[model samples]
Target: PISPIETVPVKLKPGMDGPKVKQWPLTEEKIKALVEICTEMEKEGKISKIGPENPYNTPVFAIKKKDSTKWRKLVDFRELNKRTQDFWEVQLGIPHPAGLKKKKSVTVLDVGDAYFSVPLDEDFRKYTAFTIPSINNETPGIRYQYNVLPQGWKGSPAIFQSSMTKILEPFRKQNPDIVIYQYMDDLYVGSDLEIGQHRTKIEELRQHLLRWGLTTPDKKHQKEPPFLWMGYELHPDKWTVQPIVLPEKDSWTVNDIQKLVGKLNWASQIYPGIKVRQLCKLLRGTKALTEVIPLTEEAELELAENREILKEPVHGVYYDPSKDLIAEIQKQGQGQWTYQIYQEPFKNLKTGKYARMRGAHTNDVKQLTEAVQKITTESIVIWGKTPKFKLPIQKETWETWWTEYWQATWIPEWEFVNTPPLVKLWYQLEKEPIVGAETFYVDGAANRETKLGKAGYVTNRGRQKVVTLTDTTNQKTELQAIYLALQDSGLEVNIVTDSQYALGIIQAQPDQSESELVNQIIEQLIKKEKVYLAWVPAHKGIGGN
Candidate 1:
C-alpha cells in the first residue's frame, strides 16, 4: 500500500512504448565528432589507432534528418548556448516539492499532469484523464499503464514527444515561440526582452499542459545561467551554446564530469574552456591545465598549425597561408583578379606540372588540390563527368573545381566522385588550462579535418613566450583574438601566414575579398616576428602525420 516512488533519470533502455518512430541511428554528424575525438587521441601520442582487431565496415549515406537544415558532424556549440530540452516523461505524481528537503516521486512529472502525448492507439481521452493514482486509482487488479521507461518501441521518445506535441499542437500554433524540444524537456527564452514576454509564453505553455490534464510546475522553474538541456547545457547568453558542463560538487565519472564541465564553464563569450578541456584530454594522463570545457579555439589551431617559432624576447609563432591565398598568386591579375575561362588542359609554369590549378579562388586551395591529387591517384574522380552533360558541371570543371576548392563551402560530400579521406585534422584549443594538472582539453574534433590547413607555431622557450603571429580567418574576431593575444602580451612574435589576400587587405592594398580576421592577425603578428606562412598539405597521408 505504501511503495515509495523513485524518479528515473532520463536514460535510454533497450526499448520503450510508442510507434516505431523512424530514426536514423548513429548520425554521420555524431560519428564524425566521435571519430575526430578518437583520431585526436591518436595524434596526441596518447594512443595509437588500433582497430578492435580487423578493419570494420558499415553503410555510408548522405545523412538527411527531420531538420531540413543541415548540421555539421563537428558542431561548434559556441554559437548556440541555451538549447533547452523539452521532452515528456510520466513521473509518479509527487506532492508539490516542499522545502530544502528532497522528495522522491517515481517520476519527476506526472504523465497525465504533463503536456499529454498519448500513443495514437490509446484513446486520446484516456490521456485527457491521465493520473498516477495511488493504489485506489487502480481498479481491483488493473496494473499501471506507462512507466518513465519505454518498454520496447523504436520511436518511443518521438512518439511520446509527438503525442504531447499533438495535444498542445493548437496551443503551440497559437503561440509558436514557446518551444518544447521534440527530444527533451528543457526550456529557453530571450533575456533582454520584457519579462512579460517569457511570462506570457510560459503561461500559455502551462495552460496548454493543464488543458491536456497536466499540472504545471510553480512559476519558479529552474533558471540557472547554464541550464542543462538534454545532454548539453544552454548558457544564459544565447550566443554561447556548449557541450554540457557540470560543477565539482557533481564530480563523479568522466562522462558526467565532461558534460558537467561543459555546462558550467561559461566564463565569457570567448570562453577558452574548449582549449582547456582539450589540454585535459591531451594530457588526459599527463599534464593539467587551469581550465575546463573552455570556449577557446586556441588549442585547436595550436596543434593544427604545427610549427614552432621562437621569437627573441617575444612569443614564438609561425605563419602559414591557406592554399587559396597561394592560388591567388597564380591568379594574380587586374580588377577582380578573375581566372580566364577555358576548357583546355592547364599547366603550372612554376611547378612544371601538366594539370589544372589555375584560379583566383578567395578560399584556400591547397587542401582541394591535395584532395584532387589523392583522387586522381585512386582514380576516384567524383567531380569529373556525368553521363549526361545536363547534370550540373562538366568533368573538366569538376577536376578544376576539386583541384581548386578554397573553403569548406557546404559541399555535399556524396556529390564528389572520390572516396573521402578516412581522417583529417581539426584542431581545438583553450587559451588557459583546466584544473587537473594531467589531462588533455578537447576543444573540438573535425570528421573531415582539413589537410590543406597551414600549421606552424610561434613560441619562445627562452626569456618570454614570444608568439610571432601569422594567418587570420574570414571573421575579424579570429584576427582580434590573435591581436589581443599580442597586445595583451606584446610578445615579440614573427608571424607569417599564407593569407597574402588578407595581408594586402590590411595593408589597404587593392585586393580581392579575403577574410578580415585573417588580415588583422597577419598585420599584428608580422610586427612581432618574421612570421612567414607557406603552403601545407591538407588531409595528405604523407605530410599530415
Candidate 2:
C-alpha cells in the first residue's frame, strides 16, 4: 500500500483566478484506456467519482505510443497549478571519477508511473479532478479525481521526491552498503565495488522497491558504462557528464525555438551554462511564439556555440552538517536548502552572458542530512545553487555554504526588513536629465515645540504641501515627505532627501504598516516613465539638503 502525504494539507493560495474547464474530444481507444485505468484505480482505491460541480477542474489528454493504438492518460494540470506552492526539484549530482581507474557497477530503475504511485490526500485530490465521458457511452460525462498523487502539479516533484526519500529510509537502514540515487521515480543504485560484486545489493533494493508499491520494469535494469542517469551522457572514462549537443539546424522559426528550448531546460541542472537564460531572455523579447521562432543574428550565433565549453570536473566529496543546523531547517517549515557548485563568472556555452545559478536544496533535517552525506560520498564535489538564498553555493566552500545559507535558518519572507524591494531604479546623476523625468526636492520637519509634523515637495510643475500625517514622529515626517513626492508624479523624477530614515526604510525591510507604503512606491515605480530616489548630504551647502 502506498502511504499518503497527510501533513501540510494542500492549501490553495489565498486568491486565484484559474483557467476555465475545457475538454478535448477523445477517440474510442483513448476513452477505453482512460476508463480502464480509472476502474483499476477506483478498485485499488487510488481515485474516486466526484459530483458534476467543482470549483477546480483540470483537463486530461491521451498520449499515444509509437507502436500501439492504445493511449496513455495524462493530466493537463497547468490551471490547477496556479495555487500550488513553488519549489524546485532537487537535482541529483552523480559522482564523476577523475579517471577510469576502477570499474564501478551502477544499476538504474524507473518507478513506473512515478507520480501515480505516490498517494494524495482527498483535500488536494479535488484540484486534480477531470471530467470524462462515462464508461458506458449512453451515460452522461462523469467527474473523478485522483486518490494517489498525479503528475503535472507544480508541487508534485517536491512532494513525490520527499515521500520517496521517506519511503527509502528503512531500506537504507537494512542495507547501508547499497547507495541509492533517486531523481523522482528514476532510481540509480550501485556500490563503489565492481558490477558483478554489487548484483546482490541490486537485488536487495529491487525487492524493497516492490514492497513500497514501486514497479521496476525488467528491461530498464541495466549495468553502468555510459551511466545514462538523467538525460546526460555520463562517461566514467572521462569523469564528468558531457555537455548536451543540440541538433544541427540552419535558421529557425518560433515553434522550433520553443520546442528546442523545452529540451534544453531539462539538462540545465547538470549543464546550466548552456546559454539557457539567454534563450529564456530571447524568447521573452518576443511576446508570442510566432515572433520567438525566427532566427535572428544573435540567436543564430548563440545556438551554434552549443558544444564550445565543458564544465571543469572536480572530485567527489561528502558534506556533513552539524546536528544543530538540521534541527533549525526543519523548525522553519522550510523544505530543502540545497547547495550547488559551479565555477564563478561561468560564461554561457556560446555567449558571454554570466550565469548565477551554478549551485542549488531537502525536506527536513535527518532526511536532508542523509541526502547531503550522499552527495559528499557519491558525486564529485557538491555542485549546483541555493534556492531562497539565491547564491551560487560552491563545492569548495561546503562548510561556509551551510553556515551562511542553511545554518542561518530561512527567514520568513514577510519579515524581510533587510530584503531589497523587487523594483529597479532608473536614475542618472550628473548627466543630462531624461526627457520625461519629473524632478523633486522634498523636505519634512517636526516641530517639537508645537508637537506637529509637516511634509512637502518641490517639483518642476509646482510646490505643494503633500500631507500633514497627524500625530507623527521625526522619522515619519521624513518618510512622509518622500511619500508625498511620489503620490502625484506621473513621470520618472528624482526625489532628493537628506533623511537617513526615509532612505533606510525604502532600501531595507520596513514595518508592516510601512511596508504598505513601500509597496505603493514600488507599484508606481513599475508604471512610471522612469524614477529615481537619491540622497544628498544634510546641514551642508547641498541645494536639496
Candidate 3:
C-alpha cells in the first residue's frame, strides 16, 4: 500500500573518501555532467529545474510506472547505505511538543552507515562550513541532515535528496497528483486521498527500495503534520518553538567585571549586583573607529530624491543649484516661486485599517502587517541616515528642542501634589530608566479605547484615536507630540510605551553615523531606561492606546 523509497549511491570526491562511489573525489567536470542530465530531466518535466546555486543541492527524483500508473524506485545503491550516519539532532531549545500521531505505517530506507563527507580539504571552501568538527564523531561520515551546520561537500545533501527524486520520478509521471518534498531526513509524502493513497504509494516505494538493496522503516513514518519541518521540529501549531533552556544563573560577582557605564539604554541586562562588578580597574579598554554614516541603499535613494527637490526656489528659498549671481546661464522648467517643497509629510503615512477585530482574520492581518513592514524597510533602511535637511525656515535647537529649554523636560508628571500641606514622597525609579518618550502618561493604560489605541486623542481635545492598531501601526509621531505637549504644558510625568516595536528599533542599535535623526533621538532621549517599561500585553490590547 506504500511506495518504496530508494537509495542512490553518491559519488564522492576522490581522495576525500573510498571508491565505492562511481567517481571517487568528484571533479567539477563530473558535477557539470550531472547537472546537465538533471537539466535534461527538467526540460522533460521529469524533475524540477534546480537553481544555479553555488552550493551543491542533491535533488531527489521518483520513478513512475506508466503501465501500472504507480511509482517505483529508479536506482538502488546498497553499497552507499552501509556508510551513512544513523541519526542527527539539533538542540532547538524551543519548548514545545514537536510531535504528531500517525496510525498508517510507512517506509524509510535506513542508509545503515552511508559515508557522508564534506570536502573541507578544498581551499576557500572552509568559510561556508559551520566549523563543527565533532558532529557524527568528527568526520568521514554521512551526516547530510537538513538545515544542518555540517559542510564541505557541495551537493551531498542535494545528491542524497536526488535519490528520492529519482525514485519518485516514475511515480510522478504516472500519478501527477502525488506531492513530495524532502528536507533531508524529514520527508513529506502528500496525496489527495488521505492515508489510503499515501500508504499505497509508500508500499510501492518500499519494495523498490528493497529491490535496490535499501531497507525502509515503515514504522518511523508519520501521517500527521506538520511533521518535523526543515531543521526545526514542527509542532502541529507552526508558530511557537521549543522553549530555550537558559544556562545556570551565575552568582553575582562584583570583582569579576569592570566599572564602565555609558548609555542608559544598552543591550546589557543588569542584575542586582551588577553595579558592584563595575570595578574600573578590572576592565580592559579597547576602542574601534565607527562612522555615523547613513545606511547605503535607502539613504542613497532618499538623497537622490532630495537632490531633485532642490532644483527650484520656493518662496525666496532657492532649492536647486544656484550658479550665476550676475548672469543666468539657462532656464529649462520651473514651478511657482510661492509653491512650497516639503517631504512626503511624515516618514510614515502608511494608510491601512486599524480596526479592532474586523472581518479579516489573523492571516489577513499578518499579510497587511507584512506589507507595511516591506514598505517601511524599503523606504527607510533599517540602519541608514535619515536626512534632516533645513526646512523653509532655518531649524535651530531653539526651535526643535524649544521644549527642552522652555517646557519642563523629563520631570515626573505624577508627582504627589498636595494642595494644603507640603507633601514629600520620595520614590526612586523602580527598576531601569524608561526609554523613547519625551513625555510619560502614568494613567492612560486603564482606558479601553485609549488602551486599544483607537480611542486615544490624536489632538489635545481627543480629536483623533488610534486604539485598534496592530504592532505594524506606528505611534512615533503621537509619542513625540505627547512628549512635546507634556513639556510645553509644564508636566513632569514619566512616559511609557510598549517597548516591543520601539525596542526592536532600538535594538537595531542606532549607528548615529548611519542615521543622524534616529541616532540623535536615541542618544538624547534614550538616556538609560530612566523611563519605565512595564511589560504591556501582547494581544490583549493593554497598551494599544
Candidate 4:
C-alpha cells in the first residue's frame, strides 16, 4: 500500500473549467506502443476505464527515452495545466548545486516510476482522464483516467516531493551524519564516511523509501563521485564539476533548438561562461517549433564553443568573508551591460598557495549590489564604469547621478572607480576627396515648423537619387543620405556630407551610441574597405549637390 500522504487528495484552484483536448494523431508504431502500455497499466491498476461522458480528457502520446529504444508514455496536460494554480508557497527541500561539497563517497538514487507510487483520490481521478486512440479506424477510442498521480500534471512534482520528504524524515533522523539532498525522485546522498559505510547508509535509505512504496532501482544507483547526475559530472576528489557532453545532430528544428538551450541553461550553473547569445537570437527569429532552423555561421561557432567549455572542469571555491570583493562591469553588446563579481584570491590553508575564485555575472545592477551585499557589508572595490556613464548628463554630481540612475541607496563602503576604456581607432572623415574615387554629394533640408525633411545625394558619375524622408530632423536626414549613398555602392567610394553631428556619430564607438541607424552605417563601413566619408560645405552651389 502507498503511504498515508497519498490519501490526501490534491486540491485544485477554485472556478477551474474542465478541459478536454483532442487526441493527437499517432503513427502505427506509436499506437501499438500506446495499446501495450495501456494494457499493462490497466493490469497494474494504475489506470481505470472511464465513460465517454468524462469532460476532462487530455491527449496522450509516446516519446522515445534517451539512449533507449523503449517509448515513454506522456500525457498532454497543457490545457489542464493552464486552468490549474501553482503551489506558490510550497518550496522543495532540494539543496542547490552550488552548495554541494566534496565528500569521501556519494551515492545517487532514482525512484522507479516515482509519480506512480502515489495513488490519486477516487473523487479527483476524473480530472486526470486521457484518451487512448483505437488501433482500428472503425472502433471508438477508449477513455481512461489515472488511479495514481500522473506525469505532466503541474501539481505532480510538488505533491510527490511532499510525500518523498515525509518518507525520508525517519531516515534523515536516523542518520544525521549522512548528507541527503533530493530533487523530486532523484536523491544525492553524500558522506565523509568510508565507501562501505556510505553504502550501508544508502541501503538504509532504500529500505526507508521502500516502506513508503518507493523503490530505488539498483541499476540507477551511481555509487561514487565522478558520475553524471542532474546534467553535471561531480568530482569529489578534485572538488570540481563539469557539464556532460551535449548530443550533436546534423540538423535541428525549433523545438530541438529550444531543448538544446534548456540543456545549456542548466549547464550554465557550473559553466556560466558557455555562450548562448547567438542561439537565443536564432530562437527569437524562428517562428514555429516544427520549423527547421538552419544554423547561421556564428550560431554554429557559438554551439561548438559552448560544447568545448562544457568539457572543461569548473573549480569550486570556498568563500571567506575576509577576502576582498571586486566587481567589474562590461558592455556585452549594444545596449546590453553585465557586471561580474569575484572574490580576490586568498591563501589556501591546505595547499599554502593563493587560489582564485569563480565570479558571478549578472546584467542587473541591483542584483549585483544585492549579491555583493550578501557577501559582505565591508567595502567592495568596483572596477569599471556603469552603463549610465555612456549617457549624456549635464552638470550632475555623482550622488545625484547615482540617485537618478541606480535608485538604490549609495553605499559608503563601495569604492567605485572606472577602468581604462579600450582604445578603438575611429574612421576619420576626409577633408579632400582622393584623385581617383567616386564622390557622392549628400545634403538634407527640413522645415522648422512642420518637421518635414528630405535627403538627396548625387554622385559625380551622373548617378543620383532623391529619397523622401518624413518626421526627421536635419541631422537624421543628413545621416540617412549618407546611408543611402553607401547602401549598394562598390569599393573606393567617398561619401560627402555637410552635418558635423552625423560625422560625430560615425566617429564614436559602436557601443557608445544607442542609435540603430548609426550601428547599421558602422556595419556597412566595416564590410567595405577604402570607403571614405568627406565633408563639404552645403548650399555652396556644388554640381553634385
| Candidate 3 wrongly placed segments (more than 4 Å) | 1-155, 212-214, 220-231, 236-239, 246-545
Candidate order (lDDT): 4, 2, 3, 1
lDDT of 4 by residue, 67-161 (tens): 97998788888887887666643652434333454466778887888888887777778888887776653466777998887888877777787
Cα deviation of 300 in candidate 1 (Å)?
A: 14
For model 4, the local distance difference test gives 0.62
**Per-model root-mean-square deviation over C-alphas:** 26.6, 15.6, 27.5, 11.8
Deviation (Å) of 134 in candidate 2: 5.4
lDDT of 2 by residue, 135-199 (tens): 44456566788777776677767778777787788888977766676655678775666656577
lDDT of 3 by residue, 438-470 (tens): 333212223344533321323332233333333
Which is the leading candidate under lDDT?
4
TM-score of 2: 0.44
* TM-scores for the candidates: 0.27, 0.44, 0.26, 0.53
> On residues 250-275, what C-alpha lDDT tens digit does candidate 1 reach at each position?
22344443443343233211122122
Q: How displaced is residue 420 in candidate 1, in Å?
A: 28
lDDT of each: 0.29, 0.54, 0.30, 0.62
* Higher-scoring candidate on TM-score, 1 or 2: 2
